[PDB]
C-alpha cells in the first residue's frame, strides 16, 4: 500500500506541474498578443 | 426599429460592431446577412469603441459589407403561464410540439434572484418516487437536492423517465391536513441525441404524464448558449409555478456533465484563463446559482425539488463536476455497473448511496413509523452479506457459521426482489412490506437495530413480491 | 541634503505603482510614498527606464490615488544604522525600535544586502561547539562558522530545541588546547511570520536564561505586512556580520521560519510575473536563499565568527 | 535579595542625573555644531 | 539579579535620548530665528541656487513670499518663473518642466535629513 | 465626491473614466441602480471597479460615484440578536422590504435608526479624552453596552448629553475642536483594531466538555481547528460550545454553506436558552449567514466582518467566542476572486497569498489589555472541510501551521455511539504546558500528572489492539485484560458526555479531577490485587465500578461528598474482595 | 582546433575501486555524476582531483559554496602530487564563482575553464576537468531567458539548453595537437536534479 500511495502522489504532482506550466505559457503568449494588438496598435 | 451596421471583425463565434453604445450588456440581438437569413447572438462585452457579440450558430454566410445587427431583448426574459403544462420547448422557449405559442401572464428574467435565508423553512414531507431503493433507504424530501451519479453506459435516462412518470405526493399519510396540492414535473434535457429525444417523447406520451409536465429539450447539435440557458428556463418555470400557484414541482436535470462542458466551451470562447483541470474558475458559483434555487418557503405551500443527473467522466468521483455537486447538494444516488451487467434494473447500489435529509421527512405523522429502523437494519444486513459472498469463494460454503448462510440467502433475495423491481410501481407501504418479508428470513434477535415492539408487529412474513403485496 | 518629489504616478495595481518622469531614481533605491492623508509608507525601485520606474510597495496600497500621492527618494541603496548599543534592544524587522526606547545613534551605515566574502579571505572552521545534545555532539557535530538548519513539521518542537541549543552552547577550550577563556555567544534572533504564542515562549525563555543583554531581536509578527518579511534576515545578518567582524564577537544567528520567507518570495514573484520554478516558486529562489545563507563563516586574520541555525517546517513532511 | 534591587535602583537614578550633568556642560557647542552644518 | 543592570541600562539610555532631543530642539529653535533676523538674504539665495542646480529644467521657483524683494531679481538671474506660498516658510522649491518633479530645499528638511549623522557626531562632543 | 461614467462593461468588471482622484479599494456605486463595487486598479483617468452583484442590463455612460471610504462596518448598539449577511446587511429588514427574494441594489442600515436607547453619561465637560475610553452606558438585553470613543479620536469634551432616551444618530458628546461623537462609529474590516498590549495565554477557555477541557484544552484567546465530517455531531458540538462556554458573547459566521444547513442553524438557535439567565440564547449572539448562491465578495468579507465585530466586543471588555462554519468555503471564494483578477495560481489553484490571509485572520485572536485599561479576549474556533477528509489539502496544511489546537472529529466514533466523537489519536494541543501552572494553582497540585496517567492508560490500551483483534478479549492474561477493561472504563465514563442531559452537558474541572482520581485509585488497587492474587473476572463485579459509572449525572454541588464516598468505597472494597 | 581526434584506449584512473572497476572512464571520455543533496558529488570530484593520473586538473566551482573552494586552497598545498612528487596545488587551476556571486558569471566560468583545459591539452598534457554543478549554469540560462521574455520549453528552461550542454561536452576527447603531440581532456560533470 505505501508504494502505491507514493506512486499516486508522484503522478499527481507531475500532472499538476505540467498543467501549471501550460497555463503559464498560455498566459504569457496571450499577454504578448494583447500587447501587440493594443499598446503598439 | 434601430439596426446597426458596420461590422469590423468576424472570427469564429465572435463579431465586433461599432457605434453600438446603446446595446446593454447581456442583451440578445438578431444578425441578418445579405441572403435574408436571421441568426441569433448575445452581447458579451460593451465599450465606447465597439461591442462584442457571440453568435449562437455558425457564421458561414456573414460578410462585413451587408451584415446588420438589431436589438431584441435588453435582458433575457421568458413568458410564463399556467398553460405551459403539456407543452415542449427547445430550450429558449420556442415551442417544438407544433402547437400555437402560449399567451404569457408575465415575462420573467431567467437569471432568478437568490432566496432570502430567513424566508426558508425546514423540509418536512417526502415524495413517493415508486422505487423501493429510493423511498425506503434514501428517501427524497420535498425541498431536497438529491443528484443521481451514473456511469457512461448505464440506463440513467430510463430511471429519469420512470421517476418523472411515477412521482407523487402522499397527503393521505399525513393523517391531519389530508388534502392534496397540485403536482407537476419540469423536465430539462441538455445535449441529448436524437435517439434519447425520441425515447423521452414516446415515454411521456404513452402514459399521459405529458399533461402534468413541462419539457425543455436541447439537442447535441443545438447552439451551446442554448444549452447554458435551458436549466435557467426550467428553473424559472418551476419557481413561478411553485411560488405563485402553490404547486409541488419536481425538477429533473439530465447530463449536468454536458452543461459543464458547454460552460467550458463558452469560457474558452471569451478568452478567459481556464481554472483547475481546464474548467472555469467560477464553476462552483455557477453550479450553485442553479442548484440553490430549490427549497420550501415560509408562508407558502408550494415547493421545488431537484434531481440533477450527471455521468462521471472516468467513474472518478474526484473529478471536479461530481466533487462540486457533492459540495452543493445533500447526498447522491449511485448506480452500479456490476448490478446492471447482472441484469438487475434499476441498478441502484444502496451501499454507496445516501440522503442527508432523510431523517427529517420520515417517521410518525410523515410516513409509517418504523421507516428509519427498517432502513438501518436493511443496510447493515446487506453490507454484512456482501462480504460473506466473497469469503465463501475461498473458504467454501460448508465452512460457514449457520447465520452466515442466512446472510448469504438474505443478500441474494434482497438483490432479486428489492432492487430488481423492473418497471412496476410500488407504494411506500408495499416496499416496507417487502422489506419486512426479506428481514423475516433472518433469525429474530439478530435485528439489533429495531425495537422489539416493531418486530412483534411486523415480523414473520413470506415473500410478498410474488404475491404482489396485496 | 534636499528632497525631490515625484508626482507623476501613472498606474497602481496590486503591490506595484509606476512613476512616469522619474529618470533620476537609481535601480534598487528606497523611496517614501506619501498619500493625501499624510501617511508615509516605504517602497523600493525594482525596474527603471526612460519611460517610467517600477516601485514595489512594502505594504498594502490602500488609500493611494493618482491625484495627490507623491514619491520621494530616500537613499540610492538600502542601508541600516548599526552600533554596539544594539545589544539588548528590540526591533520590528524594518529597523525601527518597538521596546519604547529612543532610536540608537548609528556608528556606521551599511548596505543590507552585504557583499560576497572573498574565498581567499575565508579560513576553514575548526572549533568544536558542545551543544549538550549527544545526537548532535557525537554524530552531527556543529562547528563555529557552520550553517546548520533544523527540519521540522507542524507539531514538532523545533523552537524548544533551538532555545535549548542557544542556552547550552559552549566551546570547551581545554580539549582543543586553546586554553583561553572566551565570552558566551551573542544571539541575533530574527522572526518572520511568528505567532504570539511562540514569540511569548521565546521571550520568556530568554528572560529566564538572562541572555537579553547579549541579544538583538528583529520581530516580524504574522499580522505584519508580507513584503517586509524579505528584509528581516538581511538586516539581522548585516548586524551579525558587523558585530562579528568589527568587534570580535562570536555570533549565533537563529532564523525563525524560512518557510514564511519563501512564501513571501513566491507572493512577490507571482505579482512580478516571473518564470515559475518547480512548484510555483520563483526560478531564482536558489540564488536568493544563497545570498542569505552564505553570509556565515569565519575570516582569516580575525577572531569573530558567524553561525546560523535556520528553522524551517517541511510542508506535509 | 530585594536590598540589592534597591541598591541597583539607587545606582540607576544616580546615573540618570550623572549623564545629564555631564551633557549639560557642552550642549550649546553641539547646537552650534549642528547649526553650522544644517545651514548652507 | 541582572534586573538591576537592565534598569541602569534603560535609565542611562532614556537620559541620553532626552539629552539628544533637547539638543535638536535648541538647534531647530535657533534655526527658526533666521527669517526674523537680517540673515535670510544670503541663506535663502543659496538654497534657491542649490534647488535650481539640482533640477536643471526648472520652470518656476516657489519660495517664501517674504523673500520676494530678493526673488524678483534672483529669478530673472536664471530666467525662471516665481510663485509664493506662505505655508512654505523657510524654504525654496523649484518645479520641473512639466511640473511632475519638484525639489524642496527648506531648512527643516535639511535638519531632519542630516539629523542621523549629526546625532552620531554630537555624541563625540557631549561624551 | 469623485464622479465618472462607464466606458466598458465586461462581466462583473466595469471600467470607468473621468475618475481621477479615486483611491484604491474604495467603495463605488455603479449605474443608477447604485450597485456597490470595489476599486482594484488605477491608471491615468481610469479606474477598475469590481461590481459585487450581477451587471445585466447596464449600459455605457451610466454614472459612477465613489464614496471615498473602504469596506467597513458600523459598530454600536443594536448588533446583538440580529442576523446579518456577509457585508452586514440585516436580513429581516430586507425580507420586510422586498419579500422572499433579495433584489439588486437594496439599501438598508446595519443599526436600526428609529429605536430609542437609554443614555447614561460618564464624562463631564472639560474632561480630556483619548481613543478607547468609555463615554457612557446603554442597556442592551441585560448587557451594559459601553459607548467607546473611536480609536483615533482625541481631544477635550465640550458638551455632554444629559441622561435620557435618544436614537443612535443623535450626537451625544461634542469635543472642543467641533468633532461630534454619537453612539456608533465606522471601522474598516481589513485593519486590526489597536490595543495596548497582547497578554500571553495563561488561563483556559473552559468549553464545558471533559474531553476538550482535559486532553486538548484551548487557552483564552487561543485558536483551534476542527474537521467537519458528516454525521459526526459537529453542529451539536458547536452549539454546545455556544451554550456552555465561558465567553460572554458568541459570534457565528456562515460563509458559503448549503441553504438547508443555514436554515437549520437559523431555526435551531432561536429555541436555545443560555444557562446563565434562562432567557433566549440569541440575546448573546450575532449571526452572519451566507448561502452558496450569494455574491462572492460577501462570502470573502464575511469572516473579516465577523472578526471585526468580535474585536469590537472585546474592546468593550468582554470575552468573545468566534466560530467560523467552514474556512474551506471561504478559501474557495478567495480562489474564485483570485481567478477573476487573472492572477497566477500557486498550488492546486489557490492564490499564493492564502496562507498570509489565514494567518492574518487568525492573529486577531488573543487576550489583550484594551485601550480603556480593561481586559478582553477573542477565541477563534475554525472548521476545515477538506475534499475527501484528506488533511494534505493546502488549506488544512496552512491552518495547522498557525493554530494551537486541533480537534479531530471522527465519523467512526459517532457510528459507534461514542459522543463527542473526537479521536484521542491525531488530536493535539499546544497549550497544555503553558496552562499547567494555572491548573496547579487553581484545580489541584496533582492535575497534570493525573492527566498524564489517563493519557498513558489510553496509549497502553491502544498499544495492544492487534492481539485483541487477532484473538479476542477473553483469551488474554490478567494484566492485559485489566488494562483493556480500565481503558473501556475511561472511554465510557470520563470521555463520553451527553449534551442533552440536564447535569451531564456541563462538567467543571473539579469534577473531571475527581473522576480521574477515582479511576487511577481503582486501577492501582486492582494492580495490587493482581500482585496479591486475584482473577480479573472477580474484580469486574465489584459495585465500586457501578459507583464510578454513576459518578456522571450528579450535581456539581453534590460531587465532593459523592467523590469522598466513592474513594472510601474503592479503598475498602479491594480489601474485602480479592 | 585540433589536427585529428582519436578513439580512447587508456583508462582514467580515479583512485576509487568501484569507479575504476565496474564503471571505467577513458582518458578522452565524459562522465556525469548526478544525485540529490548530500549524496557525495563534491567529495567524489575532490577525490578525483587529489588521486588521479592526469597531468593537470582544472576545477570549476560553478555556483557552489565558498567553503568548498576555501578547503582546497587551505589543504592542497600541504599534499603531494602522485606523479611529480611536488605540491599538489602546483598542478591545479581553480575557477570559483560561488552561489552569492553574480548569476551571469556562472555561464562564463564554464567556458573559461574548458578553454584553459583545451589550451593545456594543446601543450600536450592530459587534463581532467571537474564541473561542480551544471544545474546552476542551467539556472543562470533560465534567468537570462526570463529577462529576455522568451518562451520556456520545460520547467522554464530555454529550448536551446540541450545544444549548449552538447557543445560544452563535445570539447572533450583525445586528439592529435597541431604541434604533432598527443593530449586529452576528460570532463566529469556533476548534476543536481
Ligand atoms: N455529544 C452528543 N451528545 C448527544 N447527542 C449527540 C452528540 N453528538 C451527536 N449527537 C446526536 O447526533 C445528532 C446531530 O449530529 P449528527 O451526529 O447526526 O451529525 P450532524 O451534526 O448532523 O452532521 P454534521 O457534523 O455534518 O453537521 C443529534 O440528533 C444528536 O442526538
Ligand atoms: N566517499 C566518502 N567518504 C566519506 N564521506 C563521504 C563520502 N562521500 C560523501 N561523504 C559525506 O557526505 C558529506 C558531503 O557530501 P557532498 O558534499 O559530497 O554531497 P554533495 O553531493 O556534494 O551535495 P551538494 O551538491 O548538495 O553539496 C560529508 O559529511 C561527507 O562525510
Ligand atoms: Mg557540493
Residue numbers in the entry:
A (entry chain G): 169 to 209
B (entry chain D): 5 to 474
C (entry chain E): 3 to 319
D (entry chain I): 81 to 120
E (entry chain J): 61 to 187
F (entry chain B): 1 to 578
G (entry chain C): 194 to 386
Sentences reproduced from the published study:
V/A-ATPase is a motor protein that shares a common rotary catalytic mechanism with FoF1 ATP synthase. The V1 domain of Tth V/A-ATPase (A3B3D1F1) is an ATP-driven rotary motor where the central DF shaft rotates inside the hexameric A3B3 containing three catalytic sites, each composed of an AB dimer. When powered by ATP hydrolysis, the V1 domain rotates the central rotor against the A3B3 hexamer, composed of three catalytic AB dimers adopting different conformations (ABopen, ABsemi, and ABclosed). Here, we report the atomic models of 18 catalytic intermediates of the V1 domain of V/A-ATPase under different reaction conditions, determined by single particle cryo-EM.
Cryo-grids were prepared using a reaction mixture of nucleotide-free V/A-ATPase, containing the regenerating system and ATP at a saturating concentration of 6 mM. The reaction mixture was incubated for 120 s at 25 °C and then loaded onto a holey grid, followed by flash freezing. In these structures, nucleotide densities have been identified in the three catalytic sites. Hereafter, we refer to the structures obtained at ATP saturating conditions as V3nuc. In both state and state structures obtained under ATP saturating conditions, a bound ATP molecule is clearly observed in the catalytic site of ABopen. The catalytic sites in the ABclosed and ABsemi in both the state and state also contained density corresponding to an ATP molecule, and in these cases, the associated magnesium ions were visible. In the V2nuc and V3nuc, two sub-states, state and state were identified. V3nuc in state and state are also in equilibrium. The V3nuc structure, obtained under ATP saturation conditions shows all three catalytic sites occupied by ATP or the products of hydrolysis (ADP + Pi).
